[PDB]
Amino acid sequence: ATLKDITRRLKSIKNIQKITKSMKMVAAAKYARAERELKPARVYGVGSLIIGVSSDRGLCGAIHSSVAKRNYQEYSLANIIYYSLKESTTSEQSARMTAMDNASKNASEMIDKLTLTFNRTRQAVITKELIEIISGAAAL
Amino acid sequence: VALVYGQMNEPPGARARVALTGLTVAEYFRDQEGQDVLLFIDNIFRFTQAGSEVSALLGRIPSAVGYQPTLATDMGTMQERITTTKKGSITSVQAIYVPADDLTDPAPATTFAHLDATTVLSRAIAELGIYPAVDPLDSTSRIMDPNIVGSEHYDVARGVQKILQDYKSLQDIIAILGMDELSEEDKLTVSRARKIQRFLSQPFQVAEVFTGHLGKLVPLKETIKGFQQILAGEYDHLPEQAFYMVGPIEEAVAKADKLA
Numbered sequence: 236a237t238l239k240d241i242t243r244r245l246k247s248i249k250n251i252q253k254i255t256k257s258m259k260m261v262a263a264a265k266y267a268r269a270e271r272e273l274k275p276a277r278v279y280g281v282g283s284l285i286i287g288v289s290s291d292r293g294l295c296g297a298i299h300s301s302v303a304k305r306n307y308q309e310y311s312l313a314n315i316i317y318y319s320l321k322e323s324t325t326s327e328q329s330a331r332m333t334a335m336d337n338a339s340k341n342a343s344e345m346i347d348k349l350t351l352t353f354n355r356t357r358q359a360v361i362t363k364e365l366i367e368i369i370s371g372a373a374a375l
Numbered sequence: 376v377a378l379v380y381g382q383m384n385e386p387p388g389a390r391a392r393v394a395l396t397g398l399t400v401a402e403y404f405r406d407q408e409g410q411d412v413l414l415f416i417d418n419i420f421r422f423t424q425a426g427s428e429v430s431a432l433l434g435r436i437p438s439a440v441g442y443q444p445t446l447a448t449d450m451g452t453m454q455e456r457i458t459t460t461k462k463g464s465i466t467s468v469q470a471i472y473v474p475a476d477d478l479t480d481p482a483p484a485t486t487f488a489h490l491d492a493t494t495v496l497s498r499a500i501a502e503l504g505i506y507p508a509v510d511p512l513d514s515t516s517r518i519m520d521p522n523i524v525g526s527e528h529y530d531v532a533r534g535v536q537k538i539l540q541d542y543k544s545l546q547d548i549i550a551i552l553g554m555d556e557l558s559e560e561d562k563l564t565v566s567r568a569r570k571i572q573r574f575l576s577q578p579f580q581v582a583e584v585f586t587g588h589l590g591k592l593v594p595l596k597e598t599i600k601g602f603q604q605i606l607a608g609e610y611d612h613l614p615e616q617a618f619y620m621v622g623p624i625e626e627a628v629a630k631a632d633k634l635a
Contacts, residue, residue: 260551267552354477362440369436 238360241353245346252342258294259335266328273325280318283311288319295331298323387428394422398456398465405463414457418470423450423482440481447485454489468494492516504619505576511539531599534606535571542568563611570605573618574627591622600624 287302377400381393394416404412416422423446430443438444457467469490474480493515501508521529541564545557549565557565580590593601601624604610610617610627617631 260547264552267556351479354475354479357475358440358477358480365437365441 236352236356238353238356241349241356245349245353248342248345248349252339252346255335255339255342259332259339262328262332262335266325266332269321269325269328273321276318276321280314280321283314283318286316286319288316288323290323290327292327292331294334295327296334298327298330381425387425387432390421390425391429395453398453401465402456405460405465409463411463412465414465414467416467416469418472419486420472420474420482422453423485426450438481442481446481447488450485450489491518503572505572506620507577507579509575511572511575512536512543527603528595528599531602531606535575535602538564538568538571538606542572563608566611567605567608569615570610570613570618571602573615574601574605574621574624576620577622578620588620591626593622597623601627 289299289302293299379393379397379400381390383390385393397414397416401412401414404410423442426446426449427437427441427443430445431437435444438446443449457465469486471483471486473483477483493513495510495513497508497510497513500506500510518524519529519532524532545561545565548556577593578586578588578591580592582588583590604624605618610624613627613631614634617634618627619630621627621630
């Protein structure tokens, strides 16, 4: 508990919270659009080699870890890949939104706590340093 | 107003006592003329600090954080003379400085022992143009108890704040995902909230020489009714700007007229 370190941590968490709140809102927008375009897609897809579908971006909870854990046919093959794809981004954007909501809220809470820890420490150092001076002075 | 001053150049002992002197004066308009005097101590922290300087000079061992051993008594012997006696009452508006932004610092902590309410002036609110720039959710009061202000008063107040709180929530959404997944319901809380925020602003007679506008001293009754109705939904048709800088709701109505 050093006013230096405490400050170092607050510094990096205030940014995290900022970048994390941002990522949440972006996601919730992507999600909103995705949820809608998904309405038709389902009806369409429901109407219609291990292939795993997800994305390139992390920070969406367990989206990836979970999956990891002649003319007529050709056509119905594209329909099924499309469907899975349209379901996937909806799950992904709603999970990144959720994960970033939490992260951001944890950050803020951490912020509130470190700050209060900072003031307790700040007050004790002064008090501590002052009693030390008085003790020395009184002994004379 | 009578002004009593303890300037910063004065020695510890002087900045130490001037709040008592001011107190003396006020006690007269109460114990001699039984009025309801107003006491303004600006700022309550420099009172305490003056106390420590004096203490240190008298060679007494400081206590936690360097303040005086007698921090609590130095404060109590002064704060306690501020009350409602049978003859009248002194009410004190104390400007508070919080050291190190530490609300548990001995100076501030001691001080809240006596406070019955806080008036938080906010730069953010001001930026909304809203004035007085008081924060409706951060400012507080001990007497906001139905057992003290009465259920009506208490409910309106708790109505105004929640709505103001809810809107606060939505604020994030609106800007990002845009103002419309908003429900027949979510769109009303906003509307009203925004009407409320404005209805909470007001023209001061002190600023007439300047705002070229007439000051308003709204009465408590008028206050609770005002907000009661907005909550109620009585002026949902009225427009926002009808409520900006006015007194009683009646003026919100008339402004609307002039605003076609």
